[PDB]
Structure 1
Amino acid sequence: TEVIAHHWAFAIFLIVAIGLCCLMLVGGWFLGGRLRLSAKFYLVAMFFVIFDVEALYLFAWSTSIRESGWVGFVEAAIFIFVLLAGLVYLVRIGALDWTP
């Protein structure tokens, strides 16, 4: 009898936000009378994807930080060490600088 009201508020918020944008767009509408980009952009998107999925393990670690003891801290520390080893490998090879 409170979370149902909160879910209803979320629903009307979403529905009336999209409805406001729709009515705004149609009120603007009603009145008045062979190449290739690159490969480094794909590489930086792939860096974002892989480090975001490793950041997912950090996301799930951050909620259970206290309930897992020092052994969980050690495991997340060696996880982050592997992550930073990959990042510093990427830094040192030269695949991370842009140089336009």
Structure 2
Amino acid sequence: STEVIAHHWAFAIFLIVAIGLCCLMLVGGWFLGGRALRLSAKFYLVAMFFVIFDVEALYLFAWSTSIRESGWVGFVEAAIFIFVLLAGLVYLVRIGALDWTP
């Protein structure tokens, strides 16, 4: 189809011109104008929580686009998945894993 190849060309030109515009802005900024602590483990814990819950989020992303095809059985399975997710979240909050302040 002509429409899809036109849109592919437009998307390619969009990415190319955006990156080139930012590169040219940096080059013009460089060329113009004259010249002249230990991080706590809570950062790791928060990033780890983000990674784990983002994977469970991808499972829910795949479910959300095909809800009508899966029917009520898929609803029951996703309800079990979300209940396990929320039980893990409740466990994380109650044990002080998600409390930044001690």
TM-score between the two structures when normalised by the length of structure 2: 0.94
Q: If each structure's helix is expressed as a fraction of its own residues, which one has the higher value?
A: 2
Q: 1:68 maps to which residue?
A: 70
Alpha-carbon shift at residue 95 of structure 1 (Å): 1.0
How far residue 20 of structure 1 moved from its aligned partner, in angstroms, is: 0.4
Task: Give the Cα separation in 2 of the matches to 1:36 and 1:91.
Answer: 25
User: In the aligned structure 2, how far is the partner of 1:74 from the partner of 1:3?
Assistant: 38
Aligned length: 100
* Partner SS state of residue 67, structure 1: helix
Shift of residue 33, structure 1, vs aligned partner: 1.9
Name the CA distance, whole Å, in 2 between partners of 1:85 and 1:49: 17
TM-score, with normalisation over the residues of structure 1?
A: 0.95
Q: Which ranges of structure 1 fall in alignment gaps of 5 or more residues?
A: none
State the alpha-carbon separation in 2 of the partners of residues 99 and 93 from structure 1.
13
**Distance in 2 between residues matched to 1:67 and 1:12, nearest whole Å:** 37
Deviation at 1:18, TM superposition (A): 0.5
- Percent identical pairs in the alignment equals 100
Between the aligned partners of 1:97 and 1:76, the Cα distance in structure 2 is 28
Shift of 1:36: 2.5
Q: CA RMSD in A?
A: 3.6
| Structure 2: gaps (5+ residues) | none
Q: 2 CA distance for matches of 1:69 and 1:32?
A: 64
